Amino acid sequence: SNAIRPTIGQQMETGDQRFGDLVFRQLAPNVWQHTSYLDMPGFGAVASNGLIVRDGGRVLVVDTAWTDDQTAQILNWIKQEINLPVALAVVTHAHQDKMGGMDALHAAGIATYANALSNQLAPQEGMVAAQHSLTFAANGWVEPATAPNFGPLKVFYPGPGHTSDNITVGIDGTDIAFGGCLIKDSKAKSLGNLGDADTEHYAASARAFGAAFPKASMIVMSHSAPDSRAAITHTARMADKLR
Ligand SMILES: CC1(C)S[C@H]([C@H](NC(=O)[C@H](N)c2ccccc2)C(=O)O)N[C@H]1C(=O)O
Ligand SMILES: [Zn+2]
Numbered sequence: 001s002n003a004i005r006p007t008i009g010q011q012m013e014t015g016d017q018r019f020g021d022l023v024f025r026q027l028a029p030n031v032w033q034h035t036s037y038l039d040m041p042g043f044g045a046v047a048s049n050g051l052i053v054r055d056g057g058r059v060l061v062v063d064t065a066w067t068d069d070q071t072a073q074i075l076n077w078i079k080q081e082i083n084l085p086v087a088l089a090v091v092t093h094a095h096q097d098k099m100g101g102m103d104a105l106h107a108a109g110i111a112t113y114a115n116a117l118s119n120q121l122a123p124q125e126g127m128v129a130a131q132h133s134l135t136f137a138a139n140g141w142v143e144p145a146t147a148p149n150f151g152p153l154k155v156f157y158p159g160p161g162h163t164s165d166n167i168t169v170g171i172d173g174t175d176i177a178f179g180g181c182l183i184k185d186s187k188a189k190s191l192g193n194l195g196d197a198d199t200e201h202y203a204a205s206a207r208a209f210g211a212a213f214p215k216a217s218m219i220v221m222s223h224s225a226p227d228s229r230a231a232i233t234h235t236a237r238m239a240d241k242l243r
């Protein structure tokens, strides 16, 4: 198959597997990155990344693809490659790159979770809410009763940044943590779309993510390949410029 060469988002490199319209990359024996692409007319493709985690006899998903059809392709890939049921998905804020495929998850009977605030914003953002709401303590950690049977997914709300509702997820038992759209890579020159951002609190929120997962060495994010912790520090330094 031909390589997909997005205008925004990482390129395909060694270890990147094309499946239909999407790309998959194994990050750890039990963790894979899913990548889907939105074609913007006149601009080209924008890649967005999420995660797939095997936890024993079940699979957990972080973020949908941009669309329902792409998200059904993620479920197809899981069926072919892993052949275990998806127990739940957690989506990391109410924008299209992270929640555009909710209906595909629901059609498949998968339990969906998002920040309560994401669910409240979804109908205002042209999204369908997740079926369950996560809530958070004053220090950002998820209230465990709201995240039942999450296995290795450790959900952390770092504060407002890219959006007010953005959440992040550490993968316990690995050195991986997922920043979603809050974190950009260590070579990025921009924080991306700031239209819904909290420019005052962004730098502290980025740093809070790093402090929540202080031994995560592989930082996964929505629009770049997995990076070092310099993604966190560089994002925070860019965000310092917003104040
Ligand atoms: C990659 C993006 C610049 S766009 C994406 C998101 N936007 C969407 O999901 C929009 N529905 C969209 C509109 C036009 C073109 C592409 C995406 C956002 O506003 O954070 N996340 C941004 C980001 O992570 O900075
Ligand atoms: Zn967003």
Ligand SMILES: [Zn+2]
Pocket: 097, 181, 222, 223
């Ligand atoms: Zn994004």
